[PDB]
Amino acid sequence: SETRLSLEDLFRKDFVLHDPEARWINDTDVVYKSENGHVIKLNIETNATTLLLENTTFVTFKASRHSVSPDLKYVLLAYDVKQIFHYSYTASYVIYNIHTREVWELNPPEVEDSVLQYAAWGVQGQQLIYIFENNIYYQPDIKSSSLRLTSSGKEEIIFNGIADWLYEEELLHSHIAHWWSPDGERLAFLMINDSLVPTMVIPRFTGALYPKGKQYPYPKAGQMNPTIKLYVVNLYGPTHTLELMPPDSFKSREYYITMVKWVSNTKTVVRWLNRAQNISILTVCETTTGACSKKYEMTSDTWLSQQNEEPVFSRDGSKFFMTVPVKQGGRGEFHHIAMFLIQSKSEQITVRHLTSGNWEVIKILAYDETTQKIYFLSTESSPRGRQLYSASTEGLLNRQCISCNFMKEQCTYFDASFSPMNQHFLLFCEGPRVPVVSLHSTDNPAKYFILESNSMLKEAILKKKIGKPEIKILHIDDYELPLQLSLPKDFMDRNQYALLLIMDEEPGGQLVTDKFHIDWDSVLIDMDNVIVARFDGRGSGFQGLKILQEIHRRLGSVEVKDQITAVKFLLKLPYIDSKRLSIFGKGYGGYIASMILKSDEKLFKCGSVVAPITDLKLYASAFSERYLGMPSKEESTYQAASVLHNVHGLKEENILIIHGTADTKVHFQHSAELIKHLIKAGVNYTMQVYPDEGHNVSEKSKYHLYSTILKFFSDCLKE
């Protein structure tokens, strides 16, 4: 009874899921690192294991990032890692020679003790590239000097191979704007032109004598957007670079490139998207020429579905598999696998649907061409989980679940990765149990062995109370939505508990999920006897498009009304205390958390909001415009979704606004603007701001934040 979960535990190194950082190399050798922190080669044939790196990635300035060369003769360490946006990190690199020790500084020519925007490795051999001053550099091997592939790079204006903010956070959802041809002969990359894009300033108060902060291109709602070209260079000899032109329909009009991928060692598929995000064009490009052939096109009456989807091919290209929406009847559309048959030049490709039901095919993992099978992740088995399924491409059109019996009750939510010949696959658990990675043979899920058990962490949460989350199911409109109630160790049916209602932090995400998670609220629960509640309302993703697009043009309108009807039901329970009800949400969820805190009725005694996005006119183009469309251009519906005007009350409501000053996603401006109206409106509120922090606070401050929130919620909830 004195073995329960305290905040500083979450920072204990016992917890903190240990990720195997598994990676394929041959169809034999998997490079998964990090059991004890050791990088390891494993031959799945012989079981033979080699120690590549040891507890060394300490010794060189706390190297936080590791990558093993293709030829397995070297390791690339990143140390001095500095955050930038989300996936963007800028650090210094070093090269450990796997066979003998000796480490090199990785520097651009003429430059010493340097800092790089990106490093990684290539595909063939020991080749690697690194980005510096927004220019791409290439080293054919450890031997040779580097080769600057682009001179066009200009700091904070023209980017090469790395994403500017808009492309990283919104469009691409990763900072890697370049891609390697399968044979390492060729490199495709994005040239992003921010010349005309308006810039926002991230201030720095904490530096030297006179601190100076940066200014980056950040197009706001309806603003000038980054123009962008897609080039391709050949890494052998001449380095002739060819721009791959857009589809003729998009030529001259505003557009984004939301994906590109290699199919052959020459052809690539670049998905183009209009600024409005209602029109998709899949193009296939011959890189030796620049021949660009319209292949498939899509449209929406609201906004286009997952834009990063990557199609699988015949490796010749006779056929290819992709996921698209199918009307499915009433109950809306669901993403299902498509059979498109590419031919004969000859536009037109026959489409055959390989899947259907009310559930989604999330990702298409692999196509095993030697047989009749294709592999994917699906909610079929259950909307709350994810499972690994195979269907037979050519054939009966049948379907079968693989992951279903792995843990039974202990793994309901998966992800997986197949070897390059698809002969076997890695199965990440992430399920209700403390996550476990495992390596199976394809044709025979004998489960073989287990790569990572997260052992220490398992026994850690075992000791602690750690209850089971009752799940109620609500009917809103025509839908059925999950309400997850996480309840204190000892639960009297009798008493009146305090209720924390946590918001989904970005739209189209899924709160209630079998995915294992441990975090602050778990502490709020156990100590402090608070029940935390999550409810996935309309707009929450991963069930149908119909729930997902219920948000279009009404933002904060719908999600809020649902969150409230969910509190309503919550309210009619005996064991929750209407007197003490609190809300929490961050980012966008801070936005909705705020909308909920206005005049409808006051169901909340106190609530706390972190990096709240408070006015959509002030948020990023590709985000606002997606849901609300263009601003003063076509719509004043933008005035409607704001926290800023009409603050008309937050009454006895106790409000806590937490914001990072250096935040690059939700600018501090959002809370500044809010706080301003909040004063002129005469509303009781309390704020905590972290000088020079981001949307995600550093390790230093973070604990302080949790402590803050924890104290806040626990204290206000007291009777």
Next chain:
Amino acid sequence: ETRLSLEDLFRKDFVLHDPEARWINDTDVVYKSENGHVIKLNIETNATTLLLENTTFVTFKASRHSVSPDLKYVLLAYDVKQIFHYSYTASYVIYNIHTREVWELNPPEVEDSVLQYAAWGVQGQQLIYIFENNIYYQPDIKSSSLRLTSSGKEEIIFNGIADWLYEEELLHSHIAHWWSPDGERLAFLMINDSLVPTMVIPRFTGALYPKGKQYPYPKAGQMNPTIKLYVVNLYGPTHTLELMPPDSFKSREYYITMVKWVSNTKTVVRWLNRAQNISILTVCETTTGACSKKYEMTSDTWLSQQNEEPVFSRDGSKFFMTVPVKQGGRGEFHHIAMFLIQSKSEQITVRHLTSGNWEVIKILAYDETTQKIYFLSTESSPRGRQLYSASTEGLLNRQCISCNFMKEQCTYFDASFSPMNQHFLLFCEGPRVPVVSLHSTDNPAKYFILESNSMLKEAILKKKIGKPEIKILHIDDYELPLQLSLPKDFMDRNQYALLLIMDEEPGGQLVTDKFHIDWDSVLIDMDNVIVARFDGRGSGFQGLKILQEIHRRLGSVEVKDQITAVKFLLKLPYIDSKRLSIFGKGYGGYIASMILKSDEKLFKCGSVVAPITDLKLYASAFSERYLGMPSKEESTYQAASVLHNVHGLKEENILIIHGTADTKVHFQHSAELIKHLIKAGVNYTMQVYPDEGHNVSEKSKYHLYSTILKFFSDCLK
């Protein structure tokens, strides 16, 4: 209902009504603002004219008014935007006193403009205005303007207006130009910030993409503004002559801490070395540029009040100035000096006209037609200020004027004499709710009263509003006041909470007869908290000896005193050691912080606004004055900081309030503090106001007071 509540202080009943009195002739005084009306008064006939009416509303809430010399026009400032402290930037309009019609005041080619400065001249209707750091001149309402300087460059080269360092630290006002008595000539400062490092004031609250400014702000030991003093003639050619520095200062770092006209040609410019230990009074013939060394000063610590303005013979045979005199043990005090000017470089016999342990604060006037000179002095009492006259040529006698005005109701004064000195304005400011009055010189018949602050008087009358017991403490060889402001109903029995308020800038005086009403008065009345002020060493206006006890030990001394004062406070029966709180802002936030460390924890909670937390991060001319140069000559700078060795603030409940746009104490100070405070794991609470200054706007304001009030009241329970 009959005690003082916060929102009263914002009630327009309160808010001292300032007459904004101003002389014109030796007859007509222009004091405005009784009902908000601008008024001419003929002190001969009593005749009053209404110049302006309840119109300075109608034109966009005009916040600022000035009447032309010839009394035919009024200059309104509206759209007033704060800049630093005295610096305001607004749009101007010209009301024609005789016939209403109003003009836009614009630089040529510019429409609906915004100006850095306007005011008026001396002779006639002439006026000048500053735009893009250039000086413009209008000989009259008729004529087009005349650009007197093209050298102006935004936030780099300033003309006639002070950059931050000169406004806040050196000059203590933003007016860098001065008019010759006859309006023939204009002297002004050219401030060159080219090489001075710049600090950024961020703006989060603006339009789509807010952009904040960046101004030259030399920090401790940094590059400083270079500056020249030119003079232009406002008639014809506009030949402009630079007035060269003293030869000794030539080529070395220096400030100009004052300039004033003496004749319609000669000026006295006081020069100061960067170190602030050497003064040179120079007198300059403007038609030539002849610059003659007159008097020089030195200190072993730092030079005394630098804005002192000397009075002359109007010929220049003699002149009066205030300087320190050794006075014996007990230190030095500023007393009036008789310097006799006669031919060439230096000499000039010095005769001291005053002495004792007390100071001559300001020398107001010299009546040349008789044997008298006029000044303000602490003679009558260190806590007050009185208006004294001494006989220059003669017995060397002294007599107090203000002594019997209010007896017990006015002990603290200031005054202004008419141009011929024939009669004077006496501002009360004393213990009673301030009252301005107009007296005849040779006969203080008190004549009449200009401003009674009537409504305000009856306002505080109704409310409880107690009397401040004053204890006197012995520290070292000195005797220092401790003012205890006590709740309406005071039991000798109970244990009260104690708020200890800090003096906000060094060399100021907390305990003073000067009337004041503010938040703490509310803290007192409602919430039964006793607020305490104690003027320790370094506090000004008694001797230099108390004042300079700070040199090179900053936060060292003031703190030890503030504590020994808490000690004594602690031994009282009726104060509760359990509940003790501290408050201080700006610099006082600095000391408030030093007190909150390790010595012992005598405080349960304390609150700090725009704390200056590291002197290396404060302004050059401030830090360097007390602590001298930085890594240049001293690491004693490491000593005075809050930043390292936050070693504890224990159960201490701390509230840090800071404006984001603050241009005096940068937000950096609290950012820096807050940083260490987290890595040190200390419990603290913060409230920051986006886009506010060192002085919060009206909007936020109230919210701040509420905060502080709640904080202090709640923690003390």
